Symmetry: C2
Subunit: 251 residues, 2 copies
């Protein structure tokens, strides 16, 4: 069914149903990022912008609020429908710089090039390694000359750190430097009410892919982009910096 996490295991045992184990995407009770959008803006606008897997407009609207023309591309027709509902209930000027398009960000093709192409950490992490290559290839084909590819990328503690070195003393028949660089983790969340009474006690688990920023960056280089900047920021305006803003251009 849902993912049975270790903390959830204990809770659900302790609470005896009453408690219910759920994935974080079914029911139910269960988006604001103007600080992330702002991070994207800082790091650019000449022309129109393409947002990939724009979901429901979490960033797309903030972008439109800054006067930008946005082609928002989404795969889910249902999310697409919901986006178009929000879009319907907003000022015709706001409405008219926005273009929705169904599409697969791993293999998409528009009758249009673009000065700026943006993708949020949430989205890039939906793709495996193969599709990620598809994305890079695709994007390259949609950048006007000199245009930037801007990516936000969540940064785990392990990816934030300077990987631990281990020097050695191995003679031949030298000094050896090993590093274990992070490439990909699984972010696992568990959310439950602070009580235990409540009734019902719904326990929310989710597992998702979480790529190391440096990893994406290597992928990017390997695929013909140059990464001209990488900038840590906190997603909620202040706190620990838990995100990296990456700029890529075609050489």
């Amino acid at each position: 069914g849902p993912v049975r996490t270790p903390h959830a295991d204990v809770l659900l045992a302790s609470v005896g149903e009453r408690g219910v184990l759920c994935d974080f995407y079914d029911e139910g009770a269960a988006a604001d990022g103007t600080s992330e959008a702002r991070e994207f803006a800082t790091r650019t606008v000449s022309g129109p912008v393409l947002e990939l897997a724009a979901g429901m407009g979490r960033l797309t609207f903030p972008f439109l609020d800054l006067g930008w023309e946005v082609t928002a591309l989404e795969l889910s027709t249902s999310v697409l429908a919901a986006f178009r509902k929000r879009l319907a209930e907003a000022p015709a000027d706001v409405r008219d710089r926005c273009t929705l398009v169904q599409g697969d960000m791993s293999a998409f093709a528009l009758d249009k090039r673009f000065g700026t192409v943006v993708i949020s950490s949430g989205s890039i992490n939906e793709l495996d390694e193969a599709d990620r290559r598809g994305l890079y290839a695709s994007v390259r084909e949609h950048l006007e000359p000199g245009g930037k590819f801007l990516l936000s990328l969540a940064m785990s503690e392990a990816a934030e750190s300077e990987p631990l070195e281990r020097k050695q003393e191995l003679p031949g028949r030298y000094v050896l430097h090993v590093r274990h660089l992070p490439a990909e983790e699984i972010q696992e969340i568990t959310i439950h009410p602070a009580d235990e009474t409540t009734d019902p006690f719904v326990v929310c688990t989710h597992r998702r892919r979480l790529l190391a920023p440096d990893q994406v960056v290597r992928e990017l280089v390997r695929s013909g982009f140059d990464v001209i900047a990488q900038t840590p920021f906190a997603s909620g305006g202040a706190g620990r910096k838990d995100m990296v803003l990456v700029e890529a251009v075609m050489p």
Copy 2:
């Protein structure tokens, strides 16, 4: 063209003017034999290199089809086989092949692969491996893998709490399960990156594609000291 690490460039100028980078299988093979039993019927070792484990396996008396991709490496292996005595040599059948896609039309009691071999495939190819391996297992037959386990892979992931409102108050728990790291080397008076899967990540992948993983046994590769490897047992339901 060769990978330019941080420690390289801080030695590349911190020297002036005066390249990429391209062990004993006894303990390791024994660990495989521990989780094998009988053995009735022959064994198939995928990506056998040049016999580092194969020769151990033969000394356990086993019958081994050793699959390897490389024409050059097969040349080495064949010569080594030729210097072995004849009962060793006659229990070893070499085959050029691709561990990610191969038919051999025969099935095997046991199927075996080494950490270095599986770490050489990306995700898609590993999907193919498990599919192949399946196609080549006799029922009840065991699929054994050894997997390097780094310090990241073995540690209990650190957990972060945090209280949040609505207006209902919630508790939020976040763990980071390791899955893939990069092994980066700098040899030194010389460079190499490489894949290093988390044994757990491989296990998840085995389940995702058919097998029930019946055992995960940590062992030292050297055959002494800290257990730096994991022997995984898989079978087809």
